[PDB]
Swiss-Prot record, chains A, B:
Post-translational note: The N-terminal is probably N-(dihydroxymethyl)methionine, the hydrated form of N-formylmethionine.
Residues holding (6R)-5,10-methylene-5,6,7,8-tetrahydrofolate: 51, 169, 263
Reactions catalysed according to its record: dUMP + (6R)-5,10-methylene-5,6,7,8-tetrahydrofolate = 7,8-dihydrofolate + dTMP
Protein name as it appears in the record: Thymidylate synthase
EC category: transferase
Family: Belongs to the thymidylate synthase family. Bacterial-type ThyA subfamily.
A GO cellular component entry from the record: cytosol
């Protein structure tokens, strides 16, 4: 996508070389924002082929309030294998925080249910937010939440959403994150009888790992193709009742996939 | 300021009329980001007179982990009066979360200290974050946190900070918010022997109240003057040891003030 490629070029041209936790090294910039009008099409990168199966199943896994990769394995998803323990658990990550944020007094908060009820009963609210950044449980998580906090918005019957990603791997993670959230927006909109609006992505440490330079340069020469369209085959009883078989990506003609190692 | 005035013009040009909690009515846009190079000068609005007295005392109050307005009162600052109860309490708001975020296992995390330790020992970390958005205690707060999340970054020996403000009252609150955080960066930088970098402001529901339109247009007809200079006269033992007297703002020649009502 245009916005995406522009960010890549920006990182290359303005990035500062930074030594990081993985000891790999990165070209890094701080503070960036991009908007995706969802009416124009599903923001799925076409400059390289993206794997929808992994994107969809992970999101359904989140809404389940699940933190064990068992589910992902049943569906041949391995994106979280490098961080799961001997038993497949990742600690109280995303899923746990979304569906059952632990209060100091022992109670639990279902942020998704709250959001649904807010969108349905009080759309003008400026407090429709879901946070995965539970300071009190960060030590128990296998990896700190990258896409840590998001806010919904409603105007003229359209549902928008802004995501704050504290850390971003432009080449590997960013394409996955965009599509994942854009998908959530569509699911929320359908469940709340609202049209889709804009997906606003805001990031903190936006970077490109040194060992991805060639891949990036290759992708930057490929002209972006028209954006695909998402089709939701069925309207479930609730936001928690979606199945992988309910989504269709029409008109997705991407360029060949580009391989690159992951940093652990 | 240029960025500030341009934001106001954007809200007016692309804002949607929207009803709100206070029952006042607002013009609103969702998603915005602007950057302030702190080396250029202290980002204090000159198109209208602002009063440091309240900005500084509030920040010091925050750092103390204080949530009762008694302190503010002793120093003749009334900005928070309308939301405090009979005992002057506001609930576990900013100060409390910053200095003692409650964990489910009985612990309390001092986010400010954690950040200081990170800036010195691991400045390349992509997790240097302070969050006031405590989902589990929002119900005990007098008002949900507007400026609820911020991340620090270091590059070229300069300290930058990005703030995510979920809700923003462009005319009243923003001028305070910008100066408050720019001040925090200066204090942090001095304590970590770093230079000041950029303050990146990101907003969710950025709006202007219907009853602030004339004030807004009056301000827009003014030419921004040179930015003031911040002079810290002392280097305290810790970030929690600063006093009002330690700060000196010079070169501040602002336009006349423009009074406007606060939405409760
Ligand atoms: C974001 C996010 C979720 N995640 C989780 C996640 C967790 C830690 C991380 N750590 C680092 N350094 N970078 C990441 O992008 C990253 C991503 C992802 C995990 C793997 C792939 C990945 O390797 N992509 C392959 C396809 C693999 C497959 O489908 O089997 C690709 O080349 O596209 C992408 C995203
Ligand atoms: C941000 C922040 C902190 N806050 C707290 C705070 C709490 C609730 C809010 N509610 C609304 N609707 N808008 C706000 O900006 C807002 C701000 C502020 C509160 C009041 C003033 C204010 O009254 N401004 C007057 C000066 C009054 C004085 O000197 O005491 C002005 O004319 O500017 C500024 C900031
Ligand atoms: C985390 C998970 C995700 O969905 N998307 C991402 O981009 N990431 C990345 C960010 C960074 O590349 C790597 C490590 O982050 P950190 O060292 O813990 O700060 O994961
Ligand atoms: C809150 C506190 C501050 O620092 N600055 C701000 O702009 N605000 C504003 C946001 C909004 O106008 C009002 C809070 O109302 P709500 O919770 O968003 O409904 O104060």
């Amino acid at each position: 996508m245009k916005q995406y490629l522009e960010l890549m070029q920006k990182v290359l041209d303005e990035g500062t070389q930074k030594n990081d936790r993985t000891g790999t090294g990165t070209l890094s910039i701080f503070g960036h924002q991009m908007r995706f009008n969802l009416q124009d099409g599903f923001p799925l990168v076409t400059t390289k082929r993206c794997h929808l199966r992994s994107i969809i199943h992970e999101l359904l896994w989140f809404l389940q309030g699940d933190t064990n990769i068992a589910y992902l394995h049943e569906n041949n998803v391995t994106i979280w294998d490098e961080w799961a323990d001997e038993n497949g658990d990742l600690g109280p990550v995303y899923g746990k925080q979304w569906r059952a944020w632990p209060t100091p007094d022992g109670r639990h908060i279902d942020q998704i249910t709250t959001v649904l009820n807010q969108l349905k009963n009080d759309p003008d609210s400026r407090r429709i937010i879901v946070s995965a950044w539970n300071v009190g449980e960060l030590d128990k998580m296998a990896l700190a939440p990258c896409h840590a906090f998001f806010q919904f918005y409603v105007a003229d019957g359209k549902l928008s959403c802004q995501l704050y990603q504290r850390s971003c791997n432009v080449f590997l993670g960013l394409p996955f994150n965009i599509a994942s959230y854009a998908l959530l927006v569509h699911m929320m909109a359908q469940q709340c009888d609202l049209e889709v609006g804009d997906f606003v992505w805001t990031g903190g440490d936006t970077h490109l790992y040194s060992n991805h330079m060639d891949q990036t340069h290759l992708q930057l020469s490929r002209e972006p193709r028209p954006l695909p369209k998402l089709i939701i085959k069925r309207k479930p009883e609730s936001i928690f009742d979606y199945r992988f078989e309910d989504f269709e990506i029409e008109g997705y003609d991407p360029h060949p996939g580009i391989k690159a190692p992951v940093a652990i």
